[PDB]
Symmetry: D2
């Protein structure tokens, strides 16, 4: 059937080693669920970075990808989470996309007891049961008891 499209938002493309070693396993786990993965660092591989307007066109391309995804899978590691990822997450919330968060970072960093991060990151998630959309390890992505799988199966 038409594979669901996930926009995989991450800061992992800014580092040589992270792009090479951290992203492929996450892409693989998502694809093992039957997902069509739009990964921005891969999807922008061929830009003419010769050109001065390259940054604006990457921004417009990323904006179109988020508007056309079915859901976002946002890597929100780091203190704080990446600002580009955060802009993409807020776009997804406002457009009623499916929302899934990933953080295998064990530091807690927040102003509230309910959420391990700034509360805005959870605005598009339900009040009760948001943890089902919150993944804390790559091997958890495949879980039939978590929200990504449930969302794929109607």
């Amino acid at each position: 059937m038409k594979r669901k499209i996930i926009y995989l938002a991450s800061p992992y493309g800014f580092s040589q080693q992270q792009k090479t070693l951290l992203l492929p396993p996450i892409v693989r786990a998502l694809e093992a669920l039957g997902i069509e993965v739009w990964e921005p660092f891969a999807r922008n591989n061929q830009i003419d970075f010769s050109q001065a307007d390259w940054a604006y066109r990457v921004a417009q391309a990323d904006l179109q990808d988020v508007k056309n995804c079915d859901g976002i899978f946002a890597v929100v590691n780091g203190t704080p989470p990446d600002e580009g990822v955060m802009v993409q997450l807020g776009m997804a919330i406002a457009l009623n996309k499916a929302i899934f968060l990933f953080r295998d970072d064990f530091r807690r960093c927040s102003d509230n007891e309910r959420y391990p991060l700034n509360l805005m990151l959870f605005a598009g998630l339900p009040e009760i049961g948001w943890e089902n959309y919150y993944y804390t390890s790559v091997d958890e992505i495949q879980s039939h008891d978590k929200a990504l799988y449930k969302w794929l199966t109607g």
Copy 2:
């Protein structure tokens, strides 16, 4: 008549920043005839004894961005605040007017065109985005920049 600006900032996280940094910016925005929605003030009366206060603040902030006319996002720091970034994103996706403020003199970015991550500028024009980018509090009321022009059609 007056347009509504959502003033997104991390300045409510420090007692000193909330009292000393925010009022001057609120004053500058109001002196242009803008009705300013400042989230830390607008949620002063939310029951912070309750466990669900974080969810109610998040929905209130989401509703405010949906109902504001523009966002005025304080994007100081390396990197800019993540909640501000989420709210700027809602605003871009909802076709709100967008204005950015950064009086931080550090450059922190992935590109030479823009002083920050290019996603922050996704909702601004390709040419002339700098007219929407304020680098000092006293620049806010400048008649040559985008905020004043936006009020006067």
Copy 3:
């Protein structure tokens, strides 16, 4: 009560509003205790930024000032705390300077349950009683029940 030299390490010089509104109140609070305050953004205001070596000169003068102060007063607001403040805090720890920390940020941001920040920031403070060196408001700075006041009388 002695006139000891405090190096006042902060990121508040990087923002125009912060430099003029947040930093002076902390300078005054320390000076109200009879401290000689070494504030780096003012102390290096007489440097020649016109030529390209100004960053190496400022880095060296900051290093000397930590070498010669009696204690550091590190403003460790932000998520995370400022990296230059962090380097200078590490210099002061290794140099056995007195250590005092300031955080009026409400957000707890940490690896661990003992301390509100990354544990390394506290390596130079006692195992028990470190709270007495940890200041969470401008008003608290002058309290005679906290370590800064007692250090001046020692």
Copy 4:
């Protein structure tokens, strides 16, 4: 003769995927030069993390490790660099250890023209030729033309 000891300071132990996949390749790059690698997350994995005082014990062990290493190899990826790495780098500078910086993150984030990061990170490096101590990929670590190799071989 005793092998030179490098303290490998990084935030990579806070993320399960980063600890597993990013650290081993760097440890191997350093060991292939004959270095004894002190990596803090592994060196403290035997501490009893059920007890409340573990945070203090890790801080003191990290402090002692920096005092007893010959050099530090500081992973300063991220915006900004990790605050614990920064404290450990500051300790290393004040204690006249050899200093080496690693950043394969292509984002530039700084207050100056000369350096790609906050100028304090370079205070322990010479004014001229500091780039020789600054590594931008795992593959560069072994370069016979950069400062680590020269430091090992007199």
